[PDB]
Symmetry: C5
Subunit: 225 residues, 5 copies
């Protein structure tokens, strides 16, 4: 029969397989659309902030440039951690310590943001990996039930069992149609999350470089009046 009349004419287990695979497709495309608009906005904002800080030339100038980036700015956050470390460290003779403590801080928040970016990629990787074998389960179960049928009666003449076989194969087709776009989407999102991490670490590095240079130049100006 049709693909439709072929679905509900199948075994309850095979029905389950087909419906589950279709829902998997829905989750794939939902994740795709939302995360796509998200990454485009964040990448634009970060690129803008980064090129504005490119001119910074000191850490206080960078703070002045970043003042209006918004409270949700990742650059503003990294700059604020460096400022927080300096202020907590007021009175210390050891600039190496400040530098150490600041690098540890920035590198850790960058890492954390990357871990936010990937939330949901676990579902994509899992769907693309497991969908073909789930479809495969469906068709194996369907054809298994078919052959359990042919030796009961017990028949010959393949044309009689053909519909159950076709209905079973539809399960594998749906399994593949679910997996392939999941795999593709997973690949692009991995590439973009990597690129985003790289950009964010670029800003964090700008911050550390400014802080390091500032500490050294100030210590030198203080040692020789």
């Amino acid at each position: 029969l049709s693909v439709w009349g072929m679905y509900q004419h199948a075994d309850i287990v095979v029905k389950c397989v087909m419906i589950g695979l279709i829902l998997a497709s829905v989750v794939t495309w939902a994740i795709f659309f939302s995360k796509s608009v998200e990454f485009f906005n964040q990448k634009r904002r970060l690129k803008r902030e980064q090129q504005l800080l490119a001119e910074a030339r000191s850490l206080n100038q960078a703070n002045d440039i970043a003042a209006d980036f918004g409270s949700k700015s990742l650059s503003l956050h990294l700059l604020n951690e460096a400022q927080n470390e300096l202020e907590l460290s007021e009175g210390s003779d050891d600039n190496e310590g400040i530098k150490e403590r600041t690098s540890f801080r920035l590198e850790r928040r960058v890492a954390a943001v990357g871990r936010q970016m990937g939330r949901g990629n676990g579902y994509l990787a899992t769907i693309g990996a497991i969908s073909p074998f789930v479809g495969l389960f469906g068709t194996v179960w369907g054809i298994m039930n078919s052959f359990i049928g042919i030796a009961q009666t017990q028949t010959t003449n393949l044309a009689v069992v053909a519909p159950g076989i076709a209905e079973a194969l539809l399960a594998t087709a749906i399994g593949l149609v679910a997996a392939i776009p999941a795999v593709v989407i997973y690949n692009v999102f991995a590439r973009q999350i990597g690129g985003f991490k790289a950009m964010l670490g670029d800003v964090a590095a700008q911050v550390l470089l400014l802080q390091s240079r500032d500490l050294d130049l100030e210590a030198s100006a203080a040692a020789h009046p």
Copy 2:
């Protein structure tokens, strides 16, 4: 008709089905016990991390964590650092203290990570060998099918059907055992990674407090 499929079938395939069945049960037991364990451990650690965010020195962190409980992971990290300070008493070299402390604490995070994945070994091997076992069953079934053609001498469809049915059942059960073990192993591996990361953040907070405090004490003496 699964109970009817169960022994309608060959002794070898009875073995395949029962063994794989057990594989599934151990898989899901592991899933439920360790999964609830991870929910609880994560919830407790996240709470302790919030309370300790309010600490502006190490002594205050120790005061905040005092009543965290006997098995608290944050309390263990703080105490490891306190132990290094106590053992290093009288030393002029704060770089040495900092170094020794990080080494100890990071070495601790790793170990906690190692014991979270303790059950994962079983999952990894089950998902590893379940298709093999399954495949054996199905290879057995098709083999029997040819014995039918040989003993019956009639090559119609009704003769080959039992072996094909058996074989397919073995493949189906092989998939049911293999797939969840594999994805559960991956989910647990991810959860362990995030937990190691959170715990590493608490250790980081401890190290930063100790480093800043040492520097400030040394400057107040100069």
Copy 3:
């Protein structure tokens, strides 16, 4: 019953034995093949030229016994020269640090900068290889979809028209298999080209890291020799 009235057809008459879905799988796979080969031909000449240029720069700078001599060597390398960019970054760090007492800081900052740049370049080399790895990964399974859908249609044919024989849905079965065959032919060159690019990119990264390391070593040694000559005249 005896003899026949029928026959089969050629490649164009096989195409007539697939449904609309399988026709799409085949044509889409073949276009996929075209993008793999365009990627290959475009990136190949690019990589070759940059690799020759960099190889020359690296051999010439390997002779530099000092950071000043290295600057003289690279003087006219061109505006787009990667080596010249690394040297200019080291010079920039020295210049931004003018007035500082701490040479460790300069060394630290310079290494942090240069290593960063090398990594970025690697990323700018990897552009498009994701298309290759993805094409080589999923093309055999796109082909498999074609095959599964085809045999499904064949079993529908067996079911509506009774009895059996074959001869009817047999061409459709052959066409379905053909879809997997085309899938494999799409996957293989993608996988091989991809491996070649992974190797060549690895070597290019090593060459850049060699230039970068030579720059850092010259800067480190020169800072220390200057510091020692300033302490003890």
Copy 4:
């Protein structure tokens, strides 16, 4: 019958023999190594200085791992006598202990490769056997001319036996391989723990000594 099918089957059973040899011998090795290290680490728990750790380990047996790590640290101190730079000693000692620990891990892993591959490829040489046999059968039905698969069916069943055996060979290879891999993991952690204790003792004693010498 045929020829190569039976050689696939025998080569698989040979592979099984190798699997079992590795299993028994490695079982002994890992269990004795783990027991020795566990005790050594418990006894070293008490030492309040590097010297106290050497003295405790001094009768561990000549092949003890803990005693070797301690002797590396002691050797580095002895070689560096006369030196005013304790950061150097520390550095050198860590480098040594890191290398030595790594090398020991290398040795403990040896032979696990054979398990990994036997478990990986054993079902495919099995498959090769059946494919070869059934290929022979189907050149057989091409010869003469037959129908009624019943003539060639027993040969085809014999051919499948080769895959069956391939899977049987692979299964224990794979399990033993996993068990031994978790073992190598635990052991590397234990060895790193003793190494770490050595480094901490030496570092702390170097610092308390340098301070007391200044004042």
Copy 5:
């Protein structure tokens, strides 16, 4: 297997000849790189044993003098001496140490990379040989199904040849794929071990240099 491959299809003839060339390449790579790794690891193991006796960099240089021109150890020692000569006149021994370790660990990496050469081809052959064999079989059964119609009968004898050629493609695909991947893994493991040993020799060189710098500095400070 003689008349057989003579009567086959041109495409399947291509998959077969390609697969067997893959096989010959794997075994050529295997024999040459096998003896090469054997000789190099013998040489290095002897050198590491002999250098374990050095109590300083000069003593190591005397031990290594006749190691030969192709010796990796001599290369490492000469590199470390070169760093000492270029830094002559510098008061900063931290710098010297830093520069030296950086150089040696990169030389080690480079040797590893140079041995990783050609293992790529094994990795690629082991990667695509199942795809080619599998293509062969897919083509074979495709052609057998084309065979049944026309003549438009089922039976067996015209269905059997396509089955025979497909199975042949699988078999030769296995014979090409399996040894290529196994050899690739064995060589990757050997390369890892050699790189670790070489790093061990390098570390010996670094430690001797470090200790000598510190002892010279101490003998100058407290004469």
